[PDB]
Design a protein around this ligand. Sequence first.
Ligand code: HEM
Ligand code: HEM
Ligand code: KMI
Ligand code: KMI
Ligand code: H4B
Ligand code: H4B
Ligand code: ZN
Lengths: 410, 410
Amino acid sequence: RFLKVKNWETDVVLTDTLHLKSTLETGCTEHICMGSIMLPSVATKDQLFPLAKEFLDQYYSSIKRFGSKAHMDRLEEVNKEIESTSTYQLKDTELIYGAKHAWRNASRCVGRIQWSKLQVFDARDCTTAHGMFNYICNHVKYATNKGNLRSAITIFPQRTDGKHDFRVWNSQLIRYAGYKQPDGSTLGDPANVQFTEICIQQGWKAPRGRFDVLPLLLQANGNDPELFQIPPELVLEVPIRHPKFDWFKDLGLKWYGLPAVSNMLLEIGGLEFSACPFSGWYMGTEIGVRDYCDNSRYNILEEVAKKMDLDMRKTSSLWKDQALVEINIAVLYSFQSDKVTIVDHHSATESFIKHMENEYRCRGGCPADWVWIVPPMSGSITPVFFQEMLNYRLTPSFEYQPDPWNTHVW
Amino acid sequence: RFLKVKNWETDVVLTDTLHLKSTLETGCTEHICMGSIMLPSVATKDQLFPLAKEFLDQYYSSIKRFGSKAHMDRLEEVNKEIESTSTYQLKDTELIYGAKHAWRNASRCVGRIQWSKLQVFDARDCTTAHGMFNYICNHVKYATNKGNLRSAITIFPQRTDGKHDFRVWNSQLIRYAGYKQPDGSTLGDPANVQFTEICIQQGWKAPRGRFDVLPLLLQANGNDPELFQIPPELVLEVPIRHPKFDWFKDLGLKWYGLPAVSNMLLEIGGLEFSACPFSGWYMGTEIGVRDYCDNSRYNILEEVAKKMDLDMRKTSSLWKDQALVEINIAVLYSFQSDKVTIVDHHSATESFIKHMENEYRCRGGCPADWVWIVPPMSGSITPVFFQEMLNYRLTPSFEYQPDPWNTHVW
Ligand code: HEM
Ligand code: HEM
Ligand SMILES: CNCc1cccc(-c2cc(C)cc(N)n2)c1
Ligand SMILES: CNCc1cccc(-c2cc(C)cc(N)n2)c1
Ligand SMILES: C[C@H](O)[C@H](O)[C@H]1CNc2nc(N)[nH]c(=O)c2N1
Ligand SMILES: C[C@H](O)[C@H](O)[C@H]1CNc2nc(N)[nH]c(=O)c2N1
Ligand SMILES: [Zn+2]
C-alpha cells in the first residue's frame, strides 16, 4: 500500500504514499489500463460538506494549525453556511491555496516545479462579459510582463445552480484564427475553424490571414456571450527566425508568447469555477512540434524540409525528423533573442524530475502522467523518459469541461 | 463494457471487446494507473486444467472446429494426462499457434503486424547445453538468412518441477561485451558489465574491445550453464556510416543485424517455457536512439555532436536533438546499403496502426502499451502518438522472468 517508482537512468527509487489520499477514479481497472485515453469519464449539500471538510482539513493542516479552534470554527462556519445557502464561499487565502494546489496536482503538467509561484486574481465579484473582458486584459498584461512572463490565473464566480455559469468560450485566451478555404484547404489554425465560424457567426470581422488573433467570447452568469478583441498592444508575438537559415524568415511564421488555457474547470472544496484562465510560459516543443508540425495543425514540415533540400522521396531518410529539430531550434532561438520566456524540453524535464524529488520528500508523492510528461520529440534523451510515474487524481484539481456551444441553453 | 479507443490525428474510432477475454491483472486499480512502471508484479493441477481448457478452447475455435468431438477428445486427452502425469504436452500445431499468439498478445511490440509469419523451432527434445547451442546456432543462421531477416523462436523443454529448467542466461543471443575500466569508465556495453563478469567468471577469454560478441551461457535441465561462442561467420554485423559525413566512418561503430531476446518466458496453456529465444529485425531507433544514446549505454551523443561542430554550451541549441537525428539516419542507411532488414520508426508505427485496424475487426481488439509503442524519438510526427491504446493481458503471452544467477540453486 506504499508503492515504489523507479528511475532507470539513475537507479534512484522513491516511495509514493501520497496516492493513499487519492479519491477520484482513473479509468483503469485491475484488469485494464487506460493511461493513453485522452479524456475518460447541480451538486447537493449532502455531498458538498465532505468535500468542503476534506479541503479545509488539509488547508489548516498546511499552515500548522490543523485541528485548532480556528480550524473548528471555520469548519462550523462552512457547515452552517452549507445549511443556510446550501453552497459556500472560500476565503481569499483558501482560494489562493486551492488554486495553487490544483496546479500542483495537475499530473499532465511538466512545469509544476513553479506551482507555488502563482498569482491569483480574484474575479469572483465579476458580473458582466465586459467585467470579464477587463479582468482578462489585466491578466494578459500582468502575466506577460514585457516578455518576462509570470504565471497567473483569474477565478470568475463559481457555478451555482448550473444555468448561471461564467465561461470563457475560447480554448486559450490567445489563439490564431482558422479559416477553411474555398479550395478545400485551410488557412491559419485548422483546430480553431469550428470556433472561428462561431466567432464570425456572432459578428466577427475576420481579417482572413494566417496569424489572426481571435477575439474573446466571454459568457457571464449563464448569459449569451459577447465578442471582445484584446487590444493588440497587449498580445506579445514572436517572429520565428533560425540562427543559421536566412530563408527561415521568409516562412513568415510567428507565435504568441502567452500560453493561457481558458476552457478548464477549477474544483476547490467541492466548488466548481467554470471560468478560470491560467497562464504560464511555453515549453519550446508545444509550438515547434505540436502547433507547427501536427498533421491537423499548421503542418509545416513539408515546406521546411523543402528549403533544407532534403531527401523527401524516402520515409527512411528521417527528413521529417531533421526538419523537426531545426524548427524547434528556431522557436527557442526566436523567443530568447526577444527576451520572451521560453523553456526547452531538456531543461523542463530536468526540473520536473527535480520537482518530483521534493514532492516525494515534503509531501510523499507526485501524481504524474508519463504519456503527457514525456516531450513529443527526443523522448529518451530527456530524463523523464526513464522515470516511472504513478498517476492518480488528487484535489483541488483542474478538469476538462464540455464546450459551451454544445451544452448552453442558448 | 465495450470500450472505445479514439485516434486524434484521424478522428477514427474502434470498439474494443477483446479485453473482455482478458484474465491477468495490470497493476492499475480503479484509483491508480501504473502504465509507466516497467515491471509490475511449481504450478498445481487444480489450476493447470482451467488454463489448458481455456487455451485449447480458443485453439479449436480458431480452426473452425470449436466444440467438436475432435475438440472434446483433445480436452479429455489433456484432462486425463493432467490426472496421470499432472502436467501435459502440446501438439506441434498447438505450440505453433500458442507461440504465434504470445507474440500477437505482446502489447509492447510495435512490429506485431508480422505475428502470423513466425517460424517455430521445436527444441522440446533437447537435453544438453550442447544441444541448446546447436538449436540456437540453427536459429541464428535461419533467422538471419543472409541479411534478409526472418522471424523465429526456438522453444526448449517446458518447466516441470522448477529445479529442472532450460535457461539462456544471455538477455539477447547476440550482445556486445561490457568491461568497466581501471579508470572508472566503461568499454563496450555498460548494460552487460555484470553479465560479462559472470562470463569471464565461468572462464571466458575476453578480447576486451568495444564490440565483442559475448558467448552463450546455456543452462540445460536446471544444470550449471556452459559457455559456447556462436561461430563468428553466423553473427552478421553492420558497419555504421553516414551518407553525408565521412568522419562518421572513423567513429568506428557497428551493430549486429539480429535482435533475439532470450530471457523471457513463453506461457502456453499454463505451460511455462523458460527458454524461448525469439528474433525479428530491428526498428532503427532501438539501435540509433537507445543503444547508441542512452546515458547508461554507449553514450555517443557527446562525440557525434563534436564532429558536427555543434553549439554545445547551451542545452537549448538542441545540439543533443540534432546529433540524435543524424545517428538514426546513419543506422538506417548502413543497414539498407548492406541489404540487412531494418525498418524506420515512421514505417513501423504506420504498420502498427494498420495492424491495429485488422485486430479490432477480425478479433475485436488489440492490447497495446502506448508507453512502449511510441518510438523514443520524434514521437508525435509518427501516427501512434495520436492513437489511444487499451492495455490488457491476454494469453498465450511472453513474460519477464528473474535472472538465473539470482535464483539458481547453483
Ligand atoms: C510555468 C510555466 C508552465 C509550463 C512550462 C507548463 C508546461 C506544460 C505543458 C508542456 C503542458 C502540455 C500541454 C499540451 O500538451 O497540450 C501543460 C499542461 C497543463 N498545465 Fe502546465 N505549464 C505551466 C504553467 C501552468 C499553470 C500556471 C497552470 C495552472 C494554474 C498549469 C496547469 C496545467 C494543466 C492543468 C495542464 C493539462 C491540461 C490538459 O490536460 O490539457 N500549468 N503544462
Ligand atoms: C518483425 C520484427 C519485429 C520488430 C520490428 C519488433 C519491434 C519491437 C520493438 C521496437 C520493441 C521494443 C524493444 C525495446 O524497447 O526494448 C519490441 C519488443 C517486444 N517484441 Fe517485438 N519486434 C519484432 C519481432 C518480434 C518477435 C518475433 C517476437 C516474439 C516471438 C516479438 C515480441 C516482442 C516482445 C514480447 C516485446 C516486449 C519485450 C519486453 O517487454 O522487453 N517481437 N518489439
Ligand atoms: C490540451 N491542451 C492544453 C494546453 C494547450 C496549450 C498550452 C497549454 C499550456 C498551458 C500553460 C499554462 C503552460 C504551457 N506551457 N502550456 C496547455
Ligand atoms: C527490454 N528489451 C527487450 C528487447 C531488447 C532488444 C531488442 C528487442 C527486440 C526484439 C525483437 C524480436 C525485435 C526487435 N525489433 N527488438 C527487445
Ligand atoms: C520509466 C519508463 O516506463 C521506461 O523508460 C520505459 C518507457 N518506455 C519504453 N519504451 C520502449 N519501447 N522501451 C523501453 O525500454 C521503454 N522504457
Ligand atoms: C492518444 C494519446 O493519448 C494522445 O496523442 C496524447 C499523448 N500524449 C500527449 N502529451 C501531451 N503533452 N499533449 C498531448 O496532446 C498528448 N496527446
Ligand atoms: Zn493504468
